[PDB]
Amino acid sequence: DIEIIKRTEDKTSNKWGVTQNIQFDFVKDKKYNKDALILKMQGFISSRTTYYNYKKTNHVKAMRWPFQYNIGLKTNDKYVSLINYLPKNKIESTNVSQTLGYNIGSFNYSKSISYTQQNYVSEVEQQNSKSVLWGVKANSFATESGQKSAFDSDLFVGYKPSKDPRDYFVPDSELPPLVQSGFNPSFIATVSHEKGSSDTSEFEITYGRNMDVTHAIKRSYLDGHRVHNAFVNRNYTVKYEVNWKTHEIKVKGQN
Amino acid sequence: DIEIIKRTEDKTSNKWGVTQNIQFDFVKDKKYNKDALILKMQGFISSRTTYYNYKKTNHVKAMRWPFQYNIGLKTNDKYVSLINYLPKNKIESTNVSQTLGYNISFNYSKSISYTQQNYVSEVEQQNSKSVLWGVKANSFATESGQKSAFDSDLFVGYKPHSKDPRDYFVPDSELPPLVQSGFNPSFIATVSHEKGSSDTSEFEITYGRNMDVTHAIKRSNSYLDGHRVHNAFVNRNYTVKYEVNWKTHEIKVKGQN
Amino acid sequence: DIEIIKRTEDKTSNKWGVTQNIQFDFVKDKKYNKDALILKMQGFISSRTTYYNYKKTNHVKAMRWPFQYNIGLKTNDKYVSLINYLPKNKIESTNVSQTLGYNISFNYSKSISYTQQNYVSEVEQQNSKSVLWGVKANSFATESGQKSAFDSDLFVGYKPHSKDPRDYFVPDSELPPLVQSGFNPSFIATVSHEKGSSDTSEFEITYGRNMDVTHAIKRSNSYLDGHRVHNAFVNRNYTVKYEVNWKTHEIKVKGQN
Amino acid sequence: VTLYKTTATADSDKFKISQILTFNFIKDKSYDKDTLVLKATGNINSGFVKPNPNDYDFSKLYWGAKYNVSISSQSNDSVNVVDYAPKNQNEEFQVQNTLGYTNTAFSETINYKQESYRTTLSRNTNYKNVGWGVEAHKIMNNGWGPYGRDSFHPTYGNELFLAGRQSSAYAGQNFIAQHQMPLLSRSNFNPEFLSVLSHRQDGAKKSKITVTYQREMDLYQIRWNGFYWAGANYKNFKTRTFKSTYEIDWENHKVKLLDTKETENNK
Amino acid sequence: VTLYKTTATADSDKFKISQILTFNFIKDKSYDKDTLVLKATGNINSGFVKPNPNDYDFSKLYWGAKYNVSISSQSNDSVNVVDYAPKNQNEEFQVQNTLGYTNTAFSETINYKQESYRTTLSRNTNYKNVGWGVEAHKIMNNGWGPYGRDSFHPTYGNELFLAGRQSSAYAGQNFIAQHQMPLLSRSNFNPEFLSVLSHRQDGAKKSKITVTYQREMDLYQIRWNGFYWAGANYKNFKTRTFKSTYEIDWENHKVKLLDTKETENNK
Amino acid sequence: VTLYKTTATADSDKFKISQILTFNFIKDKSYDKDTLVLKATGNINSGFVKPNPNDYDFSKLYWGAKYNVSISSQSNDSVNVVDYAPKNQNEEFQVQNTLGYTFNTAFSETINYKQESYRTTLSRNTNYKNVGWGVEAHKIMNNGWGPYGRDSFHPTYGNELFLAGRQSSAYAGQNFIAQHQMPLLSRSNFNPEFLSVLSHRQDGAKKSKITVTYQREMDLYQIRWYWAGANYKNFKTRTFKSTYEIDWENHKVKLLDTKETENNK
Amino acid sequence: VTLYKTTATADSDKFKISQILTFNFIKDKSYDKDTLVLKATGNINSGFVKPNPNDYDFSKLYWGAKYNVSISSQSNDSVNVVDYAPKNQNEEFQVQNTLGYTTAFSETINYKQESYRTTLSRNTNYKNVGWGVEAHKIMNNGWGPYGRDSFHPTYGNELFLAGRQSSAYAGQNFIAQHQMPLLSRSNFNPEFLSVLSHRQDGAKKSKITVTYQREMDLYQIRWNGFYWAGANYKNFKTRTFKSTYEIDWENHKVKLLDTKETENNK
């Protein structure tokens, strides 16, 4: 009693270093009184992580890297509305253990909190009936000598003060995959369409990155200075059009 | 094979702060030789937790709160019998680990472990015509360890003297949901009825609370001290009387508290 | 495919304090070329635990208790063979953790872990005509560690001198169920029969106890000291003889101990 | 294989004891007898009686220390009890032994479950009767114990419900808080026992089953002797018993309550 | 048993609040009313406002400290609210008590779940209305806390988002890093609530449901006195509210948005 | 795919060895041979003989230290052993290495594994017409001490396998550990559970022979007054062999012969 | 939904690289394109070269430090790469913070550690997917982890160095072969999945190119008169095997068309 009609598009931009792998599943549910479409947003957003000598200084080198990945979907058809999407923001919950102790004169008290860290966290930045935007944000990294915060100005700062800028920074094996290679988004959105209204609708899908810069300064040891949000909304946008009656997809534009 | 006939009633009382959400499932089991009815007792009993200045004093403030929730079912039809219900009282069971050792000194260790609920549900009375449960404050997880529901210092606060009685007691984030908001009962009962006897039966369902009072007094540099009045108010209860027809499957509300 | 014919017999002996709850499942499996019968051996053997004053003395009391339960099955019919049974003897398996450490001092630790049953079931004898198990007292969890069933002080109590021999021994709450009440055996055996040879077969089923005696002596600041008589009473057993008909599936009890 | 269900109940409001019996009659073409699965539930109040807070140097309370249930058929009928639940437990526990060197260390840890009340079969169980005793077992007082019905300290006697050894008054206020007592000692026991019975098809069409529910109340008292508090527990100082007799119609799978009886004993 | 689905939506762009409503109409031959399972999702921005870093000895920010959702039918119609989720929790925790001799040692450990925001039912919940409040609960300031809306230290006040007590910096720069704040306090709440409604079959074919989404923004301020920093939190200093009214057509299983309303409050 | 079952048994009451053999004949149209799954169970007594408690300075006992089971077809028939269970184990264990500093250095290694009192391995005589297992005393804990086994050696006390105390002041016959402290297989009965799969050629003979052998090796453990211990391996052997005739056409099995043999050195 | 299967293989005996390609053609009435699930397996030898034991104060070995696989369609055909596995990991770890008074702090983190890590090639796009399986966290004995660029100011890269103050020949001062990771000295057995779409109004035949490759690192150690020290040079030798297959979308057949072996030596 449910019929699916499946369509795919795959669009790459060399300029942006982005591939969008988009799947459109039109849902004919006889129990539902509107048209429905499920958009599976996958693909690949390259980290575009890059190293270089700063100005003409020869003792400070810079690493430019993706602090945040951007994924967003928007429609302009007033007959279309967003009815579902994943992932969603969740309440953060932790496990707490607490101990009180007496030794017979001696008192002890212990509190331990435990939880799970992801390298990057996915947050809903904004959402309404016409659109949803997520940001996938650098968070915490497991290193020798403890977990390091994505806001540490020393993050990725290296060990060879060498004149090759790549050497001012941690080796690839101490970089997370989302920094060394990039991000494989997996996002989903379901939209309703009012039957017998517009024949087609436009959806604009946006994939991209915000870049931080870490300057490593030789002082001999290496010291880290951060420029947060150095480059923002470096994004690749593609505009798809769907036909609700014929299930044709057209790519109508891209930046 | 088994046919079910489903009925619902929802009754609210502003006086008592109670909503009874009742589901009546008539069971037609061909393998069973009597009539059967399952009553699913849900809803919301609000805590009615309240704060106030004690009399005319400036240094004594009071918090009134639900120490227990009451849930009861009764019939007066001789042809009806309670044949099942949940929850039922259980034996307390715990996990014990005992160690004995020595060096060449001596050592002994015993540890017990178990799970605590904020409120425990106990069967208080049950016979063929009725069952009564009490859901009773038990133990609470705080910073500084678990605290008993009978601790006179329970919920005593940090802000003497603000003039505001609410400030004499812990903030909402240190109150369990069943005190800050209330209880959503979930109780079930199954009754039999002798076939071709009475056309109708009556059931009374009771939802309510028993309140304690915690008085917070300022002393001495200043701190707050707790004194408890246990069972300050008992059986603050909302009773509704339902009538069932075993032939037509009609439900009627016959009365209220 | 598979047809089962079920029969039951239940036999009690007051002399022996034993009830045999026997189930006979005749199996007609078209893929199997002999007759088959599964015997489910259940029931109840009471511990017959008893306390008494020793001889004419006043400082020596005795507890008689079941160190081992006996369960046995045998047939007389050359056309019948035992082809399966449970429980079976198993190899002891344990978990070992071993650590070796250097502190710049060397440390070495070995720890073994396993599960203890109060009583262990061992296959004492088995052949095509019979099987015999013994269920033997093994280890008991008490305060002050695990006690072996072979400790002469096992069950020795705290109340010298009450005059009542019952007080020379631990109270019921410190006795395992198999000693305070008794054993509920659960044993199973499958036999084949050559079809169509003998019309009937006899099976003799045996349930009983071996009793130890623990003497408690008042000593010296007076305490109780334990002395054991192991295998004080052996094969206190109840035997019942059953005859099956392989064609009519009649069971008859042909005799008892 | 066919199944017929029915139920019956009986009450003693005086004793606060109630029986619920649920009956599953099974006809199995592969078996030569009728089968009946009989579940016994309902309520047995503890008979608990609080201490008077005004007693001075000596006080007592009554608590529910053992519950007995039994179901039995008639010596003259063709009905046998062939199986039942729960059965006596061959209890288990976990062990960890450790041997270390650096200086030597030995250690043994045991792990097991501790029950407030323990269920075991009645010694009177046989082919026409099954019974169970649910008996106070390992009761923790304040994180102290376990204590039981016969716990014995040379000085202090039975400290089961004793609040303090040297408490500054008042007897009757020197028992542990009611809420600290185990549930079955102060409240209601909700039995849940299973029995299977067989009935001969060449027998009477009707037969009689008797079901007894019972409580033993212990008398726990404490006393001050001018120096310290001590406690004593007297087992089964009071007994309350409710026996019902039900008629089973094997042919029509019906059950009627025929009669009931209340008996007590007071030491 | 038959199921019909539809959906409906409403937005306030000015408040950054959107509602998504998913409707499952069940018709069941065994029941004498119509059933509607109503799932309420969407977005409620936190209304968060970062501090100005140029504030010197005194600074403030606004954070989203409570979200309220409510679903109500009308007093005059035959629509009742019969069930819903989540329901208030009778919370649980694990306990381990240990006693050791070698010197006597006591310890008690408890294990429990700690949520940054807690959901409980509204006071006003009744047979025609169900509401939840999702409220800031136990919030960790680095490794310290938990703190909440009403945390109080006699000297430093409420240290909820205070970075240091003796910090040498501008006020607007002595709050914890925004990324150290709980997600719902700075970002967006994505509600997920379920309600079940019954409708009489002799009633009106159409009826009205009102759904309200709301945020309470708290005002958190910190101040230097000359010796140390201290903090204050003022609850519900700004309130933003979005209410939508939907018409249910019970006969045809359709739902239309009728009306929306934005309301705010400012202390 | 059709399945035919039968069973057969044989006993030696003299040796307290008894064989139960369960046969599953499988005919599978997708395969060009007849298949037989043969399960071998029953009993092998340990042959355990307790010590005489009147032995003064020198005592002994016999215990069941190894059990051998073997199943074989005849060199002249078309019956092969194609599979069987249990197989030899490539054993595993868990490891945790730890390195610690305190500003003092600490290293440790913990290993976790299973320990069994008897170990099962395949007979090195196993081949395409014969499979056999040895179930051998392996890791035996005396009290909390050990493990010991059949060849444990202390340069002073020798083999302390069943030795109660090194400096005990009792009779020799009384300085063995309690019987209940011995492993179950050393003092009681081994209940084998072995599986073998056989193939038979369809153009073969309709009947073939299978020979099944159950055996115990008894070790002699002796102690002498300090105290010391010696264990002598397979000082007595007891063997029971049975040959069965398989009728592959009618799926019948029939006991043809039995033989008891022993060795005493 | 209908499924058709086939397989194809290619070998370079010289390089010890072999490709196995398993093909699942799916025709699904609900989709307007042909689907191909393509599984790439086989063998990529590490190229490991043990050190000569007679080297005195300076020695070297080559080890397999990175494996690259890529699957590509032709820029002129209607064949896209729509999905694939494995994808890059947003890695997770467990944390336990503890605060104790008697004042004590501790933080424990728990995570998984791979000796080799797989990540997508940065050339991944709508017509090409590629992966790199790169030496990651390697333990010497119980020391490390080390990798391709480990750097100690004195001893350099102690990746396969047996001791610092060792009295022995260079070439007998590397760690035992069996103490090296499996992929560094043996064979890598790739397992990669790609899903490809093909337009039905397209050509009936198309071409896919599968490349398997190894990067061999040169690791060397030297004695200076006071201590041993090591250096690792990345991708000092490269060995590459590329095969191209013709996919017959109409009849669900695949045919090897050509292979090529290429190398680089620094």
Q: Do A34 and E6 touch (CB under 8 A)?
A: yes
Q: Which of D122, D146, D152 sits opposite C159 (nearest CB)?
A: D152
Q: Take residue G241 and report the two structure tokens written for it.
A: 């095997």
Rg, Å, chain A Cα set: 24
Please list every residue in chain F whose beta carbon sits closer than 8 Å to the beta carbon of residue D97. 144
Residues 99-118 of G with CB under 8 A from E: 99, 105
Q: From E140, which residue of chain G is nearest by alpha-carbon distance?
A: G97
- For chain C, the first-to-last Cα distance in angstroms comes to 40
Mutate to test the interface with E, among A1, A68, A89, A140 (most CBs of E within 10 A): A89
Q: Is F touching A (3+ C-beta pairs, cut-off 8 A)?
A: no
Can you say how many angstroms the Cα of residue C129 is from the centroid of all Cα atoms in its chain?
21
Q: Do D114 and B127 touch (CB under 8 A)?
A: no
Residue G115 main-chain phi, psi, to 5 deg: -80, -30
Q: Which of C128, C136, C150 sits opposite F9 (nearest CB)?
A: C128
Q: Take residue D208 and report the two structure tokens written for it.
A: 């009689």
Q: Do G102 and A109 touch (CB under 8 A)?
A: yes
Q: How far does G28 lie from chain E, in Å, by closest CA?
A: 28
Residue C58 lies in domain:
1-257
* CA–CA separation, G168 and G53 (whole Å): 10
- At residue A225's C-alpha, the angle toward residues A222 and A226, to 5°, is 140
- Cβ-contact G24, G3 below 8 angstroms: yes
- Buried b or exposed e, range F114-151, using 16+ CB within 10 angstroms: ebebbbbeeeeebeeebbbbbbbbbbbbbeeeeebbbe
- Cβ-contact E74, E127 below 8 angstroms: no
* CA–CA separation, G146 and G150 (whole Å): 6
Against chain F, the chains showing at least 3 CB pairs within 8 Å are C, D, G
Q: Which of D3, D20, D143 sits opposite B83 (nearest CB)?
A: D20
Three-class DSSP labels, E45-90: ECCCECCCCCCCCEEEEEEEEEEEEEEEECCCCCEEEEEEECCCCC
Q: How far does F158 lie from chain D, in Å, by closest CA?
A: 22
CB pairs under 8 A between A and G: 136
Q: From B222, which residue of chain E is nearest by alpha-carbon distance?
A: E154
Please list every residue in chain G whose beta carbon sits closer than 8 Å to the beta carbon of residue A115. 94-95
- Cβ-contact G175, G161 below 8 angstroms: yes
Task: Note whether C220 contacts F: Cβ–Cβ < 8 A.
Answer: no
- Cβ-contact F216, F47 below 8 angstroms: yes
- Cβ-contact D19, D42 below 8 angstroms: yes
Please list every residue in chain B whose beta carbon sits closer than 8 Å to the beta carbon of residue E149. 171, 173
Closest C-alpha to D46, from D217, D181, D241, D192: D217
Please list every residue in chain E whose beta carbon sits closer than 8 Å to the beta carbon of residue A93. 113-116
Q: Do C107 and D81 touch (CB under 8 A)?
A: no
Q: Which residue in the block uniquely carries the two structure tokens 């990039």? A: A182
Please list every residue in chain C whose beta carbon sits closer than 8 Å to the beta carbon of residue B110. 143
Contacts with D102 (C-beta within 8 Å, 6 or more apart), sequence order:
C105, C106, C107, C108
Please list every residue in chain D whose beta carbon sits closer than 8 Å to the beta carbon of residue C171. 148-151
* CA–CA separation, C29 and C35 (whole Å): 8
Q: Which of B12, B145, B177 sits opposite E89 (nearest CB)?
A: B177
Q: What is the DSSP letter of C168?
A: G
* CA–CA separation, G31 and A4 (whole Å): 9
Q: How far does C19 lie from chain D, in Å, by closest CA?
A: 6
Contacts with B31 (C-beta within 8 Å, 6 or more apart), sequence order:
D3, D4, D5
Q: Which residue in the block uniquely carries the two structure tokens 């004594």? A: B60
Residue D178 main-chain phi, psi, to 5 deg: -50, -45
Resolution in A: 2.4
* C-alpha distance from residue E213 to each of E15, E41, E118, E193, E245 (Å): 11, 10, 17, 11, 12
- Buried b or exposed e, range A69-92, using 16+ CB within 10 angstroms: bbbbbbbebebbbbbbbeebbeeb
Q: Write out the H or E segment, with its range, that includes residue C177.
A: helix C177-180
Q: What sign does the CA torsion over G135, G137, G143, G144 have? A: positive
Three-class DSSP labels, B31-91: CECCEEEEEEEEEEEECCCEEEECCCCCCEEEEEEEEEEEEEEEECCCCEEEEEEECCCCC
* Chain discontinuities in chain F, listed by preceding residue (C to N exceeding 2.5 Å): 103, 225
Instruction: Determine the 3-state secondary structure of D166 from DSSP.
Output: coil
Task: Note whether G95 contacts E: Cβ–Cβ < 8 A.
Answer: no
Q: Write out the H or E segment, with its range, that includes residue C20.
A: strand C18-29
Q: Which residue in the block uniquely carries the two structure tokens 């044989």? A: F10
Q: How far does G95 lie from chain A, in Å, by closest CA?
A: 5
Closest C-alpha to G160, from G218, G224, G219, G237: G219
Q: Which residues pair with C74 in a beta bridge?
A: C130, C204
* Chain discontinuities in chain A, listed by preceding residue (C to N exceeding 2.5 Å): 104, 161, 219
* CA–CA separation, A10 and A189 (whole Å): 17
Exposed, middle or buried, E171 (CB in 10 Å: 0-12/13-18/19+)? buried
Please list every residue in chain D whose beta carbon sits closer than 8 Å to the beta carbon of residue F144. 97, 99, 106
Instruction: Determine the 3-state secondary structure of B168 from DSSP.
Output: helix
Please list every residue in chain G whose beta carbon sits closer than 8 Å to the beta carbon of residue F102. none
* C-alpha distance from residue C256 to each of A253, C110, G198 (Å): 97, 53, 84
Mutate to test the interface with D, among C1, C7, C8, C256 (most CBs of D within 10 A): C8
- Cβ-contact C102, C56 below 8 angstroms: no
* CA–CA separation, F60 and F51 (whole Å): 6
- Buried b or exposed e, range F51-69, using 16+ CB within 10 angstroms: beeebeeebbbbbbbbbbb
Q: How far does D110 lie from chain F, in Å, by closest CA?
A: 15
DSSP string, F169-193: -S-GGG-BPPGGGS-HHHHSEE---
Closest C-alpha to C104, from G166, F99, F109: F99
Contacts with F220 (C-beta within 8 Å, 6 or more apart), sequence order:
F60, F61, F62, F231, F232, F235, F236
* CA–CA separation, B207 and B135 (whole Å): 11
* CA–CA separation, F44 and C88 (whole Å): 12
Residues 3-22 of C with CB under 8 A from D: 3-8, 10-12, 17, 19, 21
CATH number at residue B13: 2.70.240.10
Q: From B110, which residue of chain C is nearest by alpha-carbon distance?
A: C143
* CA–CA separation, A72 and A208 (whole Å): 9
Spell out the domains of chain G, with CATH numbers in brackets: 1-266 (2.70.240.10)
Q: Do C177 and D88 touch (CB under 8 A)?
A: yes
Please list every residue in chain F whose beta carbon sits closer than 8 Å to the beta carbon of residue C88. 191, 193
- At residue B72's C-alpha, the angle toward residues B66 and B75, to 5°, is 160
Task: Note whether E64 contacts A: Cβ–Cβ < 8 A.
Answer: no
Against chain C, the chains showing at least 3 CB pairs within 8 Å are B, D, F
Q: Is D touching G (3+ C-beta pairs, cut-off 8 A)?
A: no
Please list every residue in chain B whose beta carbon sits closer than 8 Å to the beta carbon of residue D108. 99-101
Closest C-alpha to A77, from A253, A199, A246: A199
Contacts with A144 (C-beta within 8 Å, 6 or more apart), sequence order:
none
Task: Note whether F144 contacts D: Cβ–Cβ < 8 A.
Answer: yes
Q: Which residue in the block uniquely carries the two structure tokens 């072995």? A: F194
Q: Which residues pair with E111 in a beta bridge?
A: A97, E94
- Cβ-contact D71, B61 below 8 angstroms: no
Q: Do E13 and A81 touch (CB under 8 A)?
A: no
CB pairs under 8 A between D and F: 3
What technique solved it?
X-ray
Residues 115-134 of D with CB under 8 A from B: 115-117, 134
- For chain A, the first-to-last Cα distance in angstroms comes to 40
Q: Report CA dihedral (B115, B119, B124, B129) to the nearest 10 degrees.
A: -110
CB neighbours of residue C45 within 10 Å: 27
- Cβ-contact C127, F13 below 8 angstroms: yes
Q: Do F22 and C128 touch (CB under 8 A)?
A: no
Q: Which of E140, E188, E253 sits opposite A127 (nearest CB)?
A: E188
Q: Take residue F216 and report the two structure tokens written for it.
A: 């115990």
Please list every residue in chain G whose beta carbon sits closer than 8 Å to the beta carbon of residue E143. 97, 99, 105
Q: Write out the H or E segment, with its range, that includes residue G183.
A: helix G182-185
Q: How far does B69 lie from chain E, in Å, by closest CA?
A: 12
Q: Take residue B64 and report the two structure tokens written for it.
A: 């009134």
Task: Note whether D112 contacts C: Cβ–Cβ < 8 A.
Answer: yes
Rg, Å, chain D Cα set: 23
- For chain D, the first-to-last Cα distance in angstroms comes to 51
Q: Do B143 and A98 touch (CB under 8 A)?
A: yes
Q: Do D122 and C178 touch (CB under 8 A)?
A: no
Residue F91 main-chain phi, psi, to 5 deg: -65, 155
Q: How far does E147 lie from chain G, in Å, by closest CA?
A: 16
Q: Which of C90, C96, C124 sits opposite F115 (nearest CB)?
A: C96
B152 conformational bin, left if phi > 0, alpha if psi -120 to 50, beta if neither: alpha
Query: How many structural domains are present in chain B?
Result: 1
* CA–CA separation, F6 and C193 (whole Å): 11
Q: What sign does the CA torsion over C211, C216, C217, C219 have? A: positive
* CA–CA separation, B257 and B240 (whole Å): 7
